[PDB]
Write a protein that binds this DNA or RNA. Structure first.
Ligand SMILES: [Zn+2]
Lengths: 71, 83, 132, 56, 101, 217, 129, 25, 221
RNA sequence: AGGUCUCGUAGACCGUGCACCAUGAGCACGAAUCCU
RNA sequence: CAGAUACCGUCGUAGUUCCGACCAUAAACGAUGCCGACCGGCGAUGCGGCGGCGUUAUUCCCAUGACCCGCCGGGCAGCUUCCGGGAAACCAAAGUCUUUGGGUUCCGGGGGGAGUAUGGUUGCAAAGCUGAAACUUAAAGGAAUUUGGCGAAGGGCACCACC
RNA sequence: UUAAAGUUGCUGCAGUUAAAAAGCUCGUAGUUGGAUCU
């Protein structure tokens, strides 16, 4: 810190809270939208039903047909 | 450096500079081994004994080694007192 | 043109460094000297070596040299370094003495000697020639 | 006093690259090249092609 | 990076200078940044001064000079070869080149 | 020089100093030469105090004679003002001379032909011989430089303030430094005038050489 | 403006010790400052020192030696206990065999070892090693 | 594409969609 | 086969006159041969290579690759060194790296922690080094802790004879040459930090140049 | 009364100009493990 | 010009100019917050004060202006370096920092999305202030050395270039 | 989810050029405030 008073605690705490809010990994875990937009809803595994088999391509120079399943 | 036994344990002791009273490292190559010859008091010829000093390299690189040698000569009385 | 390379120059410089007393300005003598003390497998190189030795001996006989070192310390400059005048060039009958230097004599150890004369003040002007 | 060994031909691929290995003192021009260096050019037979040797 | 200690100008504690116009171009270059030229020359140059001398009603008449000040944009100052480029170590020379001719 | 009264200005050394011109210097001040000086005058020539110059000349003489072997004392000059003086100084004392175009790496590069590992360096001028002072940092070489009022004091150990621009001044001071070290070595007595010639250490131009040898016999 | 006088005094004497100057001028003075260099000089880190006693805040000139590495302050003056003293000297000192902590104490301004051996403590001032 | 004309295009798009929203009501 | 020297120190160490290299470290004399170290240190001086990397300047004829080789040297009773030599062939680069590390070995002192009992095991103070953008700290440790650090300063501190310490590193420590030189000039700073037991006035003995100068000037020209 | 004052060399500016780019598949390629 | 509602040239509305009512955005940049302490040398310039040979407003004496030699304090600036620092360009501050702590405001956590959407607020209008997320990627960037390439400049050589 | 993260820095980060000092000034809380009393 650079605000170094003996009676400076609430200013340092509020500044630390704001600068910790200015983050990405903390903002992912402490917001409702980042977990609401997750397909599992915060779960490790999930079950599903297969409706169509889709084959997708690859990226740059490495090129192969990678086979996936739409669930 | 001593210990609780009572005998010396360090491999060697480094020298001390005579102006800023710092040590001279083993890889500092700008140190001085200046000797000033004091003479006999009724003839003026060299007697045989020397008078050694040591100045570290930072004092040389700042440029104040000459006035340092002058002050050590003033303290040892080799140079004249009034100057 | 006739610009010679470093081989003949270095060979002539080292043979004039090692041998300075047994040579001279005569081309047909020191050519056979550098034959008999140095093994040169060619002839044109020997001719260039002897010519360059003659040129550098003319150069060192005229004046000082800046390429080699000397042990006979150059007789033609030795005579100029050893000639002496009768006057010692410092015991002048009168010295132009600054009054500041007159006070320097006055305060250090001495008073007013006859060899030092107080200069009249001709210092009414100043210094630092104009630079802008 | 010195040597030059060079191998040319097909070496690990289809493009023919040549590799040169030099050391020591070596002259390249003059009359003493006739009687200070020696030349030898040989052709080596392999299953995939031929390789050249110019040792000196 | 920062090429020069200053910025090609002579402004240190001002923040604003009056703009001027170039002679060849019409660029609104600032006054302290532009290359300013002050040249002196005769009214007619030395290809005809003897013929002017032997055409006068006066005796040993002195030909008058011409005075003009030129303001150059730096692109025009390099395109017209008034000032060239230098090395890194040669850039620290504020003195003008010597005028032998 | 000590409190003993055998090592001061007898009567004539100050007269030789005022005749040669070892008392007046340049025209700019130096912050390490604020005590080896008295006052700037009109015409802007600073005046060097002379007793301090004498005391550091004794100090440099003591530092030279303090080492036992004189063969490893490198005396250095590159300027044309003191080429002859350092050569005859090395002839008088037994020192090792370097006169004109000091080779870089003489004390550092050890496989070259011009290699020397000395113990003391004696320098004519610090500004002109800035290259021996740089090479004196990598190896333990104390140095003595005949300094001026316009000479930077870098990597130096004993400074003798003098006007090192006139040939008479440097020739006389090199000569009397040789005189002092041969007096301290135990070969030259102080009681009698032994002196060969003060002009014998003087550099002189070829034009004045030619005209005075044509005028004289 | 100037608030911590001891911080300015120790920064000045640290710069003088770093550049090898034998004496330094300290422009203001206080009883806490002269007691701090009394602690330093009793411990043997520095030498003699004068006080320029005039009708304003005094000036201190010191006789430095080469036995000094660094002078520092702790700002603001935190309070410590006997339990938390080892926490301060574990991370504030280069070694456990030398170096001292000067802290204000009701028994007098004094080093950390005396405060340990008489069992009291207080607000901290600075350090030297 | 530098930032000036990108900002100008975003400004024009925002002005067009704001005009369409304010005239759509 | 037989060694003939260049400088005066070769005569001084071969004429049975310099008993130990601690005098050379005391007077801070420069060293310029990789063989006085061979005279004073026997088979205790190990050699382990740290890293081989290629460096490329590239011209119209493509890139040509010379090879840079870091090596760390040191006996296990004190002295430790480092040297970097870059050339074309691997073997002569390795040999030149051994030579240049063999010249620049620095002596070190070791301290205690808490109580001064037995032989020393850790660094006496907190010393650091500065090169590039890396930091190497040397914090003293209680006995039996061991060296906790990256593997390269683990190798350096085990080879130097340091039994135990604590370290901390900051910056881009991926560059092993800069990090190793930071460790080298951190451990070389264990002298240059004045401690209160070194407070007494030193005595200067006779320099080895003054000791045998009359024999030296007659045993070499 | 002499009548072409002596000595040395840059003293070069003096009339020079331009309509323009749209042209486009490629790049890698060794250490043996060395005493030496 | 292959193609100009571009570079170039001739006209030309609103503006460029004044008084009052607005908006508050610039490479508003020394791309470096403010106060205070410490830490090298040198030469100049602007202001105020102070000391001193000499010249001038014609010749003698005082004060004023001018010139010259210094000193002090504040300010825009300049040259050099192993004080020191930095990744390096470079810096007397960007120094006094693992040997970290003089006091105190604003502000940044890979690159895009994005200064975008929504909500508020201000404004006649244009538009300023606060300001995300979903998704996507393993790079985006800073300093600097060698051949490379110029519709950049400066030189050298050649009767397979010229006179 | 924690340590490695000195990439949330109170110990203990950065703001000339990589992410960054409001265009500038005034101004009430909040913070920090010269010496001296046995
Ligand atoms: Zn223009």
């Amino acid at each position: 810190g650079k605000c170094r008073g003996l009676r400076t605690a609430r200013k340092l705490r509020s500044h630390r809270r704001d600068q910790k809010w200015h983050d990405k990994q903390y903002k992912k875990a402490h917001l409702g939208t980042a977990l609401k937009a997750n397909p599992f809803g915060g779960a490790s595994h999930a079950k599903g039903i297969v409706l169509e088999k889709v084959g997708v391509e690859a990226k740059q120079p490495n090129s192969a047909i990678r086979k996936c399943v739409r669930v | 450096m001593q210990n609780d036994a009572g005998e010396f344990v360090d491999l060697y002791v480094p020298r001390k500079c005579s102006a800023s009273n710092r040590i001279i490292g083993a890889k500092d190559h700008a140190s001085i081994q200046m000797n000033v010859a004091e003479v006999d008091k009724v003839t003026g010829r060299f007697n045989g004994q020397f008078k050694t000093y040591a100045i570290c390299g930072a004092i040389r690189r700042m440029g104040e080694s000459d006035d340092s040698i002058l002050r050590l000569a003033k303290a040892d009385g080799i140079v004249s007192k009034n100057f | 043109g006739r610009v010679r390379t470093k081989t003949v120059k270095k060979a002539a410089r080292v043979i004039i460094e090692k041998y300075y007393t047994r040579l001279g300005n005569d081309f047909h003598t020191n050519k056979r000297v550098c034959e008999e003390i140095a093994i040169i497998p060619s002839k044109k190189l020997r001719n260039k070596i002897a010519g360059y030795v003659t040129h550098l001996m003319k150069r060192i006989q005229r004046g000082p040299v800046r390429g080699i070192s000397i042990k006979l310390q150059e007789e033609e400059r030795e005579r100029r370094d050893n000639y002496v005048p009768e006057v010692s060039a410092l015991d002048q009958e009168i010295i132009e003495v600054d009054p500041d230097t007159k006070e320097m004599l006055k305060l250090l150890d001495f008073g007013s000697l006859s060899n030092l004369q107080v200069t009249q003040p001709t210092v009414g002007m100043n210094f630092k020639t104009p630079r802008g | 006093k010195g040597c030059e060994v060079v191998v040319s031909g097909k070496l690990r691929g289809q493009r023919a690259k040549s590799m040169k290995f030099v050391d020591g003192l070596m002259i390249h021009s003059g009359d003493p090249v006739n009687y200070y260096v020696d030349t030898a050019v040989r052709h080596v037979l392999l299953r995939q092609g031929v390789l050249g040797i110019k040792v000196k | 990076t920062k090429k020069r200690r200053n910025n090609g100008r002579a402004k240190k504690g001002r923040g604003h200078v009056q703009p001027i116009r170039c002679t060849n171009c019409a660029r609104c270059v600032p006054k302290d940044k532009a290359i300013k030229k002050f040249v002196i020359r005769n009214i007619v140059e030395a290809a005809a001064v003897r013929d002017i001398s032997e055409a006068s009603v006066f005796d040993a008449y002195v030909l008058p000079k011409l005075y003009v000040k030129l303001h150059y944009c730096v692109s025009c100052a390099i395109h017209s070869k008034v000032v060239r480029n230098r090395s890194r170590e040669a850039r620290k020379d504020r003195t003008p080149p010597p005028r032998f001719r | 020089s000590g409190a003993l009264d055998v090592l001061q200005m007898k009567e004539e050394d100050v007269l030789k100093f005022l005749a040669a011109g070892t008392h007046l210097g340049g025209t700019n001040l130096d912050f390490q030469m604020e005590q080896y000086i008295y006052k700037r005058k009109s015409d802007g020539i600073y005046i060097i105090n002379l007793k301090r110059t004498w005391e550091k000349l004794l100090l440099a003489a003591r530092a030279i004679v303090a080492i036992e072997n004189p063969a490893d004392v490198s005396v250095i000059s590159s300027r044309n003002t003191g080429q002859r003086a350092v050569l005859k100084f090395a002839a008088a004392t037994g020192a090792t001379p370097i006169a004109g175009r000091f080779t870089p790496g003489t004390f550092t590069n050890q496989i070259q032909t011009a290699f020397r590992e000395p113990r003391l360096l004696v320098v004519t001028d610090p500004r002109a011989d800035h290259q021996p002072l740089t090479e004196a940092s990598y190896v333990n070489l104390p140095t003595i430089a005949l300094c001026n009022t316009d000479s930077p004091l870098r990597y130096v150990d004993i400074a003798i303030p003098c006007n090192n621009k006139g040939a008479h001044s440097v020739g006389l001071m090199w000569w009397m430094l040789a005189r002092e070290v041969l007096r301290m070595r135990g070969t030259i007595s102080r009681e009698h005038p032994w002196e060969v010639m003060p002009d014998l250490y003087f550099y002189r131009d070829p034009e004045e050489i030619e005209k005075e040898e044509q005028a004289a016999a | 403006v100037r608030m911590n006088v001891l911080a300015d005094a120790l920064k000045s004497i640290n710069n003088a010790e770093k550049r090898g100057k034998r004496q330094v001028l300290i422009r203001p003075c206080s009883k806490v400052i002269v007691r701090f260099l009394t602690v330093m000089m009793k411990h043997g880190y520095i030498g003699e020192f004068e006080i320029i006693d005039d009708h304003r805040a005094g000036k201190i000139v010191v006789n430095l030696t080469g036995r000094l590495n660094k002078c520092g302050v702790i700002s603001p003056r935190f309070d410590v206990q006997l339990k938390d003293l080892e926490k301060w000297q574990n991370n504030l000192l280069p070694s456990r065999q030398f170096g001292f902590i000067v802290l204000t104490t009701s028994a007098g301004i004094m080093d950390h070892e005396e405060a340990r051996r008489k069992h009291t403590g207080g607000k901290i001032l600075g350090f030297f090693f | 594409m530098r930032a000036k004309w990108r900002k100008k295009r975003m400004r024009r798009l925002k002005r067009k969609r704001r005009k369409m929203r304010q005239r759509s009501k | 086969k037989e060694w003939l020297p260049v400088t005066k120190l070769g005569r001084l160490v071969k004429d049975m006159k310099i008993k130990s290299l601690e005098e050379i470290y005391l007077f801070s004399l420069p060293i310029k041969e990789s063989e006085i170290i061979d005279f004073f240190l026997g088979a205790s001086l190990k050699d382990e290579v740290l890293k081989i990397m290629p460096v490329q300047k590239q011209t119209r004829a493509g890139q040509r690759t010379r090879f840079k080789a870091f090596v760390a040297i040191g006996d296990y009773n004190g002295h430790v060194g480092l040297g970097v030599k870059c050339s074309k062939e691997v073997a002569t680069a390795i040999r030149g790296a051994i030579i240049l590390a063999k010249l620049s070995i620095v002596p070190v002192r070791r301290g205690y922690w808490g109580n001064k009992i037995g032989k020393p095991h850790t660094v006496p103070c907190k010393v650091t080094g500065r090169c590039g953008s890396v930091l190497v700290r040397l914090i003293p440790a209680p006995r039996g802790t061991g060296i906790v650090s990256a593997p390269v300063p683990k190798k350096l501190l085990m080879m130097a004879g340091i039994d135990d310490c604590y370290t901390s590193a900051r910056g881009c420590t991926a560059t092993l040459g800069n990090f190793a030189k930071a460790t080298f000039d951190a451990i070389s700073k264990t002298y240059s930090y004045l401690t209160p037991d070194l407070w007494k006035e030193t005595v200067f003995t006779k320099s080895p140049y003054q000791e045998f100068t009359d024999h030296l000037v007659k045993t070499h020209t």
